[PDB]
Design an enzyme around this catalytic site. Structure first.
Site, PDB file in Angstrom:
ATOM      1  N   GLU A  67     -19.235 -10.367   1.748  1.00 39.33           N
ATOM      2  CA  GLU A  67     -18.869 -11.626   1.116  1.00 39.33           C
ATOM      3  C   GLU A  67     -17.870 -11.349   0.004  1.00 39.33           C
ATOM      4  OE1 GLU A  67     -21.676 -13.883  -1.293  1.00 39.33           O
ATOM      5  OE2 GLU A  67     -23.083 -12.249  -1.547  1.00 39.33           O
TER       6      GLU A  67
ATOM      7  N   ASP B  93     -18.540 -13.834  -9.988  1.00 43.12           N
ATOM      8  CA  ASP B  93     -17.572 -13.967  -8.901  1.00 43.12           C
ATOM      9  C   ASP B  93     -16.187 -14.437  -9.406  1.00 43.12           C
ATOM     10  OD1 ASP B  93     -19.915 -13.482  -7.149  1.00 43.12           O
ATOM     11  OD2 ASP B  93     -20.381 -15.588  -7.457  1.00 43.12           O
TER      12      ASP B  93
HETATM   13  O1  LIG Z   1     -24.251 -19.900 -22.849  1.00 42.97           O
HETATM   14  C1  LIG Z   1     -22.875 -19.595 -23.064  1.00 42.97           C
HETATM   15  C2  LIG Z   1     -22.481 -18.435 -22.170  1.00 42.97           C
HETATM   16  O2  LIG Z   1     -23.573 -18.262 -21.304  1.00 42.97           O
HETATM   17  C3  LIG Z   1     -23.595 -16.898 -20.901  1.00 42.97           C
HETATM   18  O3  LIG Z   1     -23.165 -16.917 -19.537  1.00 42.97           O
HETATM   19  C4  LIG Z   1     -24.030 -16.206 -18.647  1.00 42.97           C
HETATM   20  C5  LIG Z   1     -24.122 -16.982 -17.328  1.00 42.97           C
HETATM   21  O4  LIG Z   1     -25.023 -16.390 -16.316  1.00 42.97           O
HETATM   22  C6  LIG Z   1     -24.302 -16.497 -15.047  1.00 42.97           C
HETATM   23  O5  LIG Z   1     -25.165 -16.891 -14.011  1.00 42.97           O
HETATM   24  C7  LIG Z   1     -24.838 -16.104 -12.892  1.00 42.97           C
HETATM   25  C8  LIG Z   1     -26.043 -15.958 -11.997  1.00 42.97           C
HETATM   26  O6  LIG Z   1     -25.698 -15.483 -10.680  1.00 42.97           O
HETATM   27  C9  LIG Z   1     -25.702 -16.606  -9.904  1.00 42.97           C
HETATM   28  O7  LIG Z   1     -25.774 -16.213  -8.605  1.00 42.97           O
HETATM   29  C10 LIG Z   1     -24.468 -16.117  -8.158  1.00 42.97           C
HETATM   30  C11 LIG Z   1     -24.108 -17.212  -7.186  1.00 42.97           C
HETATM   31  O8  LIG Z   1     -25.061 -17.415  -6.175  1.00 42.97           O
HETATM   32  C12 LIG Z   1     -24.763 -16.516  -5.173  1.00 42.97           C
HETATM   33  O9  LIG Z   1     -25.543 -16.788  -4.013  1.00 42.97           O
HETATM   34  C13 LIG Z   1     -25.129 -15.993  -2.909  1.00 42.97           C
HETATM   35  C14 LIG Z   1     -26.196 -15.865  -1.849  1.00 42.97           C
HETATM   36  O10 LIG Z   1     -25.991 -14.562  -1.568  1.00 42.97           O
HETATM   37  C15 LIG Z   1     -26.150 -14.280  -0.194  1.00 42.97           C
HETATM   38  O11 LIG Z   1     -27.431 -14.018   0.240  1.00 42.97           O
HETATM   39  C16 LIG Z   1     -27.271 -13.046   1.126  1.00 42.97           C
HETATM   40  C17 LIG Z   1     -28.123 -13.242   2.309  1.00 42.97           C
HETATM   41  O12 LIG Z   1     -27.924 -14.492   2.875  1.00 42.97           O
HETATM   42  C18 LIG Z   1     -29.169 -14.966   3.321  1.00 42.97           C
HETATM   43  O13 LIG Z   1     -29.704 -14.211   4.369  1.00 42.97           O
HETATM   44  C19 LIG Z   1     -31.034 -14.652   4.719  1.00 42.97           C
HETATM   45  C20 LIG Z   1     -31.041 -15.311   6.087  1.00 42.97           C
HETATM   46  O14 LIG Z   1     -32.270 -15.350   6.861  1.00 42.97           O
HETATM   47  C21 LIG Z   1     -31.844 -14.951   8.205  1.00 42.97           C
HETATM   48  O15 LIG Z   1     -32.501 -15.515   9.329  1.00 42.97           O
HETATM   49  C22 LIG Z   1     -32.060 -14.899  10.544  1.00 42.97           C
HETATM   50  C23 LIG Z   1     -33.165 -14.889  11.594  1.00 42.97           C
HETATM   51  O16 LIG Z   1     -32.867 -13.689  12.268  1.00 42.97           O
HETATM   52  C24 LIG Z   1     -32.943 -13.914  13.669  1.00 42.97           C
HETATM   53  O17 LIG Z   1     -33.786 -12.940  14.226  1.00 42.97           O
HETATM   54  C25 LIG Z   1     -33.617 -15.224  13.815  1.00 42.97           C
HETATM   55  O18 LIG Z   1     -33.231 -15.847  15.060  1.00 42.97           O
HETATM   56  C26 LIG Z   1     -33.012 -15.946  12.679  1.00 42.97           C
HETATM   57  O19 LIG Z   1     -33.813 -17.111  12.459  1.00 42.97           O
HETATM   58  C27 LIG Z   1     -30.409 -15.371   8.163  1.00 42.97           C
HETATM   59  O20 LIG Z   1     -29.695 -14.895   9.241  1.00 42.97           O
HETATM   60  C28 LIG Z   1     -30.145 -14.526   7.007  1.00 42.97           C
HETATM   61  O21 LIG Z   1     -28.781 -14.562   6.563  1.00 42.97           O
HETATM   62  C29 LIG Z   1     -29.904 -14.678   2.102  1.00 42.97           C
HETATM   63  O22 LIG Z   1     -29.406 -15.538   1.079  1.00 42.97           O
HETATM   64  C30 LIG Z   1     -29.466 -13.272   1.856  1.00 42.97           C
HETATM   65  O23 LIG Z   1     -30.120 -12.499   2.798  1.00 42.97           O
HETATM   66  C31 LIG Z   1     -25.716 -15.493   0.479  1.00 42.97           C
HETATM   67  O24 LIG Z   1     -24.356 -15.318   1.019  1.00 42.97           O
HETATM   68  C32 LIG Z   1     -25.800 -16.544  -0.597  1.00 42.97           C
HETATM   69  O25 LIG Z   1     -26.866 -17.429  -0.225  1.00 42.97           O
HETATM   70  C33 LIG Z   1     -23.342 -16.841  -4.999  1.00 42.97           C
HETATM   71  O26 LIG Z   1     -22.649 -15.824  -4.253  1.00 42.97           O
HETATM   72  C34 LIG Z   1     -22.948 -16.701  -6.434  1.00 42.97           C
HETATM   73  O27 LIG Z   1     -21.763 -17.456  -6.767  1.00 42.97           O
HETATM   74  C35 LIG Z   1     -27.035 -17.097 -10.345  1.00 42.97           C
HETATM   75  O28 LIG Z   1     -27.413 -18.321  -9.675  1.00 42.97           O
HETATM   76  C36 LIG Z   1     -26.601 -17.319 -11.761  1.00 42.97           C
HETATM   77  O29 LIG Z   1     -27.685 -17.537 -12.649  1.00 42.97           O
HETATM   78  C37 LIG Z   1     -23.246 -17.548 -15.306  1.00 42.97           C
HETATM   79  O30 LIG Z   1     -22.170 -17.444 -14.398  1.00 42.97           O
HETATM   80  C38 LIG Z   1     -22.770 -17.056 -16.620  1.00 42.97           C
HETATM   81  O31 LIG Z   1     -21.892 -18.033 -17.202  1.00 42.97           O
HETATM   82  C39 LIG Z   1     -22.575 -16.235 -21.797  1.00 42.97           C
HETATM   83  O32 LIG Z   1     -23.078 -14.982 -22.233  1.00 42.97           O
HETATM   84  C40 LIG Z   1     -22.561 -17.182 -22.940  1.00 42.97           C
HETATM   85  O33 LIG Z   1     -21.377 -17.029 -23.722  1.00 42.97           O
END
Ligand SMILES: OC[C@@H]1O[C@@H](OC[C@@H]2O[C@@H](OC[C@@H]3O[C@@H](OC[C@@H]4O[C@@H](OC[C@@H]5O[C@@H](OC[C@@H]6O[C@@H](OC[C@@H]7O[C@@H](OC[C@@H]8O[C@@H](O)[C@H](O)[C@H]8O)[C@H](O)[C@H]7O)[C@H](O)[C@H]6O)[C@H](O)[C@H]5O)[C@H](O)[C@H]4O)[C@H](O)[C@H]3O)[C@H](O)[C@H]2O)[C@H](O)[C@H]1O
Length: 596
Positions: free
Chosen positions: A261, A12
């Site tokens: 998003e 991001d």
């Molecule tokens: O070592 C030296 C250096 O290292 C090496 O570097 C490499 C490194 O690796 C990278 O790691 C990056 C990786 O990515 C990271 O993830 C990114 C971060 O997390 C993201 O999280 C965003 C989530 O996404 C979206 O989810 C979407 C959606 O939202 C939710 O929806 C479910 C929910 O349930 C429903 O219930 C509704 C019912 O319906 C009705 O009927 C009922 O009444 C209700 O009860 C609700 O409405 C729904 O929404 C779920 O989550 C999904 O469906 C959501 O927006 C966020 O949660 C974030 O965006 C992002 O920043 C990961 O963690 C990481 O490991 C390092 O950066 C890099 O450095 C290099 O090589 C070496 O040199």
């Protein structure tokens, strides 16, 4: 003279320029700098604490935010969660010591899909260390006392910054609609407070747009001086119907639990448009992150696409019709006979972008992370230049930025065969690969598509296929597979569909079949114990048919039949007949199959 690249993994990314140097700030306290948008150096230590490169003592500093989410809590059990920041220079920000001017980083913390908050920190220097100021927008708060599993945090709304604002008269009081009947957070209509983006508008005012899935993207007006929201203070509707909330602000995109998003908004002083970029889908390699594009004459909306449809959904509906799909999953496949080595250049789930609009040259760049074919959840930063097409839409360059710029383009350099990618409107984990068209000297388009084309002025492309018109530009690109600069186009229809063109080198059929024959390699055929894969297709629709000299050793399709233990090794010969149009080549492969 070949371009050099140095990659970094920042998730991001959010670009900002500070003098001679470009900076990007990503999730997980990750950040890198470049002087040329091609060679990046990372300078951060990530979530390391303390001596954290950006925040110092992570836990104590940002503790104002961690009281609510993002530290050793729920989905951030045994860790931290500091997501999707934005950074900029605020010449108007009044410091603790009365002097004006500071760098601001607006960050997210999160612990569930709905419980999260946006806060910010300031600093004398852009590389940090930043110093907390406040936590300004909460979500996932509840009507009565309650708790998430493996969380000790009282979610009741009286634990947010809302009561303080009700005291200071900035809000009337709690809005009933924020809660379902059971008193839980109503994220059908209201946001999940992450992904803040900070943009200035036409008259120099400050704004923050934010959000991810759930109720949608909201924008708040921002006090340039303090860094805090000027909350609407009363609910209402925008003239065209879009929800305005007293606390959350104005809804500019999404809604009804659907994806969306990574909001980024830019004012273009020349076209007098605010361009809204947003990413659909799910971020990982099987989720299909698209980048989407809208525009509005106002920073507050209504934002619409080239089709003139609203970014704000009418209900729980497929959101894929809405917004220019400016990039999806693609692969410029290196088929048998194409120069270079490897599978070709492709992206999987590119997105969550920022934009840099250069004040000097007016060149625009798209900056995003992306995953890659065959590489799982591995990701890197990529930069693609954007060019303004004739209808006031930036159109994305097919290839990563390598120093190219708009030029006078001559018809004779345009005529030829092209590999074409059409990003369409639907999205999934499907990787879209090229068809083969050509732009003929007579200004027709033949091959895998049929139509007409026009160069207009120095470099304006107009591509017409089956009654759709795609407007964009002809531009020079670096093709890292053939390792040459190539003619290319990108164009956008008023259906919000983008098509890409990469020009193949000039070849006749008799030359293609011989390029295919020279590339066709079955690997080591001397010590064969597995089935061989026999390609039926080479580049530019060349058929490759196969025959075997002995079906009992190996079949037409490459299935081998190993002799029983304690036998002599066996041999057959496979013949590839290679045909493009009227041309033909032959290659024979000698196969030795080992007994069990
Ligand atoms: O070592 C030296 C250096 O290292 C090496 O570097 C490499 C490194 O690796 C990278 O790691 C990056 C990786 O990515 C990271 O993830 C990114 C971060 O997390 C993201 O999280 C965003 C989530 O996404 C979206 O989810 C979407 C959606 O939202 C939710 O929806 C479910 C929910 O349930 C429903 O219930 C509704 C019912 O319906 C009705 O009927 C009922 O009444 C209700 O009860 C609700 O409405 C729904 O929404 C779920 O989550 C999904 O469906 C959501 O927006 C966020 O949660 C974030 O965006 C992002 O920043 C990961 O963690 C990481 O490991 C390092 O950066 C890099 O450095 C290099 O090589 C070496 O040199």
């Amino acid at each position: 003279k070949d371009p050099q690249f140095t990659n970094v993994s920042v998730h991001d990314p959010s670009i900002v320029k500070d003098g001679d140097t470009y900076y990007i700030f990503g999730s997980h306290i990750e950040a890198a700098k470049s002087k040329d948008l091609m060679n990046w150096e990372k300078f951060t230590n990530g979530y390391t604490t303390p001596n954290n490169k950006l925040y110092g003592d992570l836990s104590k500093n940002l503790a104002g935010s961690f009281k609510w989410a993002g530290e050793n809590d729920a989905d951030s059990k045994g860790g931290f969660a500091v997501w999707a920041p934005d950074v900029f220079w605020n010449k108007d920000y009044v410091n603790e010591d009365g002097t004006k001017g500071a760098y601001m980083i607006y960050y997210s913390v999160s612990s569930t899909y709905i419980r999260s908050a946006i806060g910010y920190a300031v600093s004398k220097h852009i590389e940090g260390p930043y110093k907390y100021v406040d936590t300004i927008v909460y979500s996932g708060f509840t009507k009565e006392e309650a708790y998430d599993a493996n969380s000790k945090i009282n979610k009741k709304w009286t634990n947010t910054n809302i009561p303080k604002l009700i005291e200071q008269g900035k809000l009337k009081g709690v809005r009933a609609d924020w809660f379902h009947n059971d008193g839980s957070y109503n994220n059908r209509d209201f946001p999940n407070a992450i992904d803040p983006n900070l943009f200035y508008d036409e008259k120099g005012n400050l704004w923050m747009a934010y959000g991810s899935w759930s109720g949608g993207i909201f924008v708040l007006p921002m006090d340039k001086t303090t860094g805090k929201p000027i909350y609407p203070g009363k609910d209402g509707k925008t003239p065209d119907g879009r929800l305005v909330d007293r606390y959350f602000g104005i809804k500019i995109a999404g809604g009804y639990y659907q994806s969306g998003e990574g909001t980024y908004i830019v004012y273009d002083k020349n076209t007098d448009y605010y361009y809204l970029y947003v990413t659909y889908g799910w971020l990982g390699a099987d989720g299909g992150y698209n980048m989407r594009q809208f525009r509005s004459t106002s920073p507050t909306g209504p934002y619409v696409d080239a089709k003139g449809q609203s970014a704000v959904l009418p209900g729980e509906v497929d959101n894929s019709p809405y917004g220019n799909k400016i990039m999806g999953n693609f692969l410029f496949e290196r088929k048998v006979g194409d120069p270079g080595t490897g599978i070709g250049v492709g992206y999987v789930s590119p997105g969550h972008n920022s934009v840099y609009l250069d004040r000097k040259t007016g060149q625009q760049f798209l900056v995003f992370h992306t995953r890659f074919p065959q590489s799982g959840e591995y990701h890197e930063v990529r930069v693609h230049q954007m060019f303004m097409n004739k209808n006031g839409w930036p159109v994305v360059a097919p290839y990563r930025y390598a120093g190219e710029k708009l030029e006078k383009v001559n018809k004779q350099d345009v005529v030829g065969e092209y590999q074409l990618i059409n990003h369409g409107k639907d999205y999934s984990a499907d990787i879209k690969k090229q068809i083969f068209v050509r732009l003929n000297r007579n200004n027709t388009i033949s091959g895998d598509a049929t139509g007409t084309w026009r160069k207009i002025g120095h470099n304006q492309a107009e591509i017409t296929i089956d009654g759709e018109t795609y407007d964009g530009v002809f531009v020079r690109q670096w093709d890292p597979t053939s390792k040459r600069y190539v003619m290319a186009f990108t164009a956008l229809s008023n259906e919000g569909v983008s098509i890409w063109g990469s020009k193949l080198a000039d070849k006749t059929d008799e030359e293609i079949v011989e390029d295919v024959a020279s590339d066709l390699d079955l690997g080591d055929t001397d010590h064969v114990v597995s089935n061989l894969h026999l390609p039926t297709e080479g580049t530019r629709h060349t058929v490759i048919s196969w025959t075997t000299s002995d079906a009992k050793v190996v079949s037409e399709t490459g299935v081998v039949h190993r002799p029983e233990v304690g036998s002599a090794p066996v041999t057959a010969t496979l013949t590839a007949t290679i045909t493009k149009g009227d041309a033909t080549a032959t290659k024979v492969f000698h196969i030795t199959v080992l007994p069990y």
